[PDB]
């Protein structure tokens, strides 16, 4: 329906949803919600609704603006708004808080547990607050407004705000005349009869694109997946048995990165990556391209021996699955048996994105020619060698 | 039905989003491709539906029908129903030269969406506007020049022959009746809807809303603060984006792959290996690879001697090496060395690893595991096995 039945109820719901909007936000117009900045367990907000009007109003409200008058200003009620009118008259709101450390906003010191907003009844007969509340609840459902509890209440001034001397559920008030009449009998001159509209801050609160609202402890960020009714989630957990937080990705089968860096002993690292290497024929030095490091990290390299022999040039080790080794060169140039070994050296220097790698195999003297690639007691950049090259980046 | 106030704001908010985007699903916004200063969009809303529907829409999707397509309304959607019935939208454009998208010839200055009133008694348009605006404000929208108007055709679209602000209709009974007297049945009565989003925006389940730049997605933790948030940063000089997880103590994955020099890899995992008695090849099970990557292997020398079978190297902290087998059956000293080969071949998910130590001749027996000048698959060897997966 597009027609207003109760016009007081229409106004109550509007004010009620805007209180709902306000309570669900950590930030308003790029600034911390003022009500989160204190550390008190209870605070009562006045019926004049100053606390809900913008700071840029002719008379200043408490809701912050962006300071810049070029921006759109998020607002809750108009500057001249007054809801102390009609049979159900706004009387103030009781916010209850719990202490809270926000993971990223030191201005926030508490979180809202519940809001109870009071509308005192001014109709000629006290029992008609039942009917008026019924129009509020009906108008709420018509407008998509979800409160968490509706009650008829008697409230009295407190040291701080108010407290509820007596309360009765809306349903028991309309269905049980005995409870109703007994309740109305407690409505002495010092008490205020009122409709209590209760908001409870739950896990339903919306996550904001500015990140001002945190996920609840141990909750899971989930994706629907083509497995059908399967769900694949991640979360940030804390295990006190080691005082550490964990970004838990173990529900997903593979984490796929492009670049990847991690820390070891305070230093930043990339994973070690390996290649299988042999020298080209002819005893020429080896060049290996240096990996691209993320900015602020530097190249590292290490070569470790996999296979070797004293064949020098008379060998092919380039296949990982078999080794061809044809003996050591003799003084007459012929291939003899394999000479005995005394050392292997692997050397490497970085020069403009290229790792220059040289090697030597030291062998028994008195066997090799006097000159050449294999000579004296040295086999230079030999083919009779396979090494594993490891690269990583670090700071 | 009783969803009319929701539909009015839903449709108007989607039209406003359309008007705020230069591109939809990687293609230029069709409405921007001309330079006329005003244009009116049809009430059937085919122009707002996706092209890949039974009836073809005018809003582009990506050419690929795999991933999700940003859309505004469903394809069977019809908003020309109810007491407030969608009547079309009048767009106003300004001339604009695009810095990087040559297909756009105009920019959007204003969009007004009209919803025709089909109630029998026109005096109730005030209440109906009240539920529409209530739904607008509940969704974080401010109405812009919210007004009740009477409209009749024009050259391109429609013009507001008579109008009264929503505020005057509710607060000024004389202007209301004066306006209502003008609202005869021959004329068309309409609500004029212009929405500006003033509240912040919730992250949505279709992923259409991005986190703001420099914002942190946070979890409450009993650890307190500064260790529970993650974010995506930008480096302006090195033109790199970073998913910053360093506030979390440990990132715990199952499978993990990364890129190195154009190749995709999984991290190397290492094992300490020795051959057992008997001179047989050693079988090492290949790790299971992620889809599209294949097994790699490397073995490197840790410890060795020439004792061959007369050894136990399987302790990492000490080595037992009892010399080289002599041909007369006795054990002598450790013979001198000439080579070590480590070989590996992958067969049906098993890496078959073989090794040989070449030593001086004239020492070993003529036959056996250690014979001639070779110690075959010797025990007097410990090697480190590296495995990884790559494409």
């Amino acid at each position: 329906e597009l027609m207003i039945k109760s016009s007081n109820a229409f106004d109550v719901i509007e004010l009620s949803s805007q209180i709902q909007r306000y309570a669900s936000l950590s930030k308003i117009n790029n600034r911390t919600n003022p009500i989160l900045k204190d550390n008190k367990a209870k605070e009562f907000k006045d019926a004049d609704l100053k606390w809900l009007k913008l700071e840029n109003c002719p008379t200043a409200g408490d809701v912050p603006t962006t300071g810049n008058n070029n921006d759109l200003q998020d607002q809750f009620i108009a500057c001249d708004a007054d809801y102390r009118k009609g049979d159900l008259s706004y009387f103030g709101s009781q916010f209850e808080f719990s202490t809270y450390v926000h993971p990223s906003n030191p201005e926030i010191q508490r979180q809202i547990k519940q809001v109870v907003s009071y509308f005192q009844y001014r109709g000629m007969e006290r029992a008609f607050i039942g009917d008026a509340a019924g129009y509020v609840i009906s108008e709420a459902k018509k407008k998509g407004f979800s409160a968490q509890d509706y009650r008829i209440v008697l409230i009295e001034p407190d040291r701080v705000g108010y407290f509820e001397s007596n309360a009765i559920s809306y349903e028991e008030f309309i269905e049980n005349p005995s409870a109703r009449e007994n309740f109305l009998l407690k409505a002495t001159k010092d008490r205020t009869l009122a409709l209590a509209v209760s908001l409870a801050q739950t896990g339903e609160i919306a996550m904001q694109r500015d990140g001002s609202v945190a996920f609840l402890e141990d909750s899971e960020l989930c994706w629907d997946t083509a497995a059908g009714s399967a769900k694949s989630c991640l979360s940030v957990r804390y295990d006190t048995v080691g005082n550490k937080t964990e970004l838990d990705l173990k529900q997903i089968d593979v984490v796929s990165a492009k670049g990847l860096s991690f820390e070891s002993d305070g230093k930043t690292k990339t994973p070690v990556v390996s290649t299988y290497e042999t020298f080209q024929d002819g005893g020429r030095a080896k060049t290996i391209n240096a990996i691209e490091c993320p900015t602020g990290l530097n190249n590292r390299f290490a070569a470790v021996v996999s296979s070797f022999s004293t064949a020098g040039q008379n060998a092919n080790f380039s296949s990982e699955s078999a080794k061809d080794s044809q003996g050591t060169t003799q003084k007459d140039g012929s291939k003899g048996p394999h000479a005995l070994l005394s050392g292997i050296s692997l050397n490497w220097t970085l020069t403009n994105k290229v790792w220059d790698v040289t090697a030597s195999i030291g062998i028994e003297s008195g066997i090799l020619p006097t000159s050449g690639i294999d000579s004296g007691s040295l086999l230079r950049n030999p083919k009779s060698l396979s090494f594993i090259a490891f690269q990583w980046c670090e700071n | 039905k009783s969803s009319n106030a929701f539909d009015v704001i839903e449709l108007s908010s989607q039209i406003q989003r359309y008007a705020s985007l230069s591109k939809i699903n990687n293609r230029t916004n069709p409405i921007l491709k001309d330079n006329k200063a005003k244009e009116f969009k049809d009430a059937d809303l085919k122009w707002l539906k996706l092209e890949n529907c039974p009836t073809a829409g005018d809003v582009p999707t990506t050419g690929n029908n795999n991933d999700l397509q940003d859309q505004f309304i469903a394809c069977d959607a019809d908003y020309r129903k109810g007491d407030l019935s969608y009547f079309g939208s009048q767009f106003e454009f300004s001339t604009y030269v695009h810095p990087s998208n040559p297909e756009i010839q105009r920019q959007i200055k204003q969009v007004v969406s009209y919803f025709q009133y089909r109630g029998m008694e026109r005096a109730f348009i005030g209440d109906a506007a009240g539920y529409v605006i209530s739904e607008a404000k509940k969704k974080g929208f401010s109405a812009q020049d919210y007004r009740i108007v009477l409209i009749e055709p024009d050259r391109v679209g429609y013009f507001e022959s008579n109008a009264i602000s929503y505020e005057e209709f509710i607060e000024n009974p004389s202007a209301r009746e004066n306006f209502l007297l003008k609202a005869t049945k021959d004329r068309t009565l309409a609500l004029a809807v212009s929405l500006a989003q003033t509240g912040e925006i919730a992250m949505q389940r279709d992923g259409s809303v991005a986190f703001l730049e420099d914002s942190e997605l946070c979890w409450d933790t009993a650890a307190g603060s500064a260790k529970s948030c993650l974010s995506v940063r930008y480096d302006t000089v090195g033109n790199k984006t970073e998913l910053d997880l360093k506030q979390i103590d440990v990132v715990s994955a199952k499978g993990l792959s990364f890129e190195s020099d154009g190749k995709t890899k999984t991290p190397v995992v290492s094992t300490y290996e020795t051959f057992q008695d008997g001179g047989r090849a050693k079988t090492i099970n290949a790790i299971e690879c992620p889809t599209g990557l294949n097994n790699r292997f490397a073995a490197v020398v840790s410890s060795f001697s020439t004792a061959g079978q007369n050894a136990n190297f399987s302790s990492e902290s000490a080595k037992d090496s009892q010399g080289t087998t002599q041909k007369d059956g006795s054990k002598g000293p450790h013979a001198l060395l000439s080579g070590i080969s480590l070989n590996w071949t992958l067969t049906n998910k098993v890496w078959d690893v073989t090794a040989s130590i070449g030593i001086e001749s004239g020492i070993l027996p003529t036959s056996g595991i250690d014979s001639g000048s070779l110690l075959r698959n010797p025990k007097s060897l410990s090697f480190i096995a590296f495995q990884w997966c790559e494409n």
Binding site: S325, P337, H338, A339, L340 | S338, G358, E360, S361, S373
Partner: peptide, 11 residues
């Protein structure tokens, strides 16, 4: 290494 492999000696 295949079984053709041979070395020098101290014998």
């Amino acid at each position: 290494f295949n079984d053709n492999y041979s070395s020098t000696s101290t014998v």
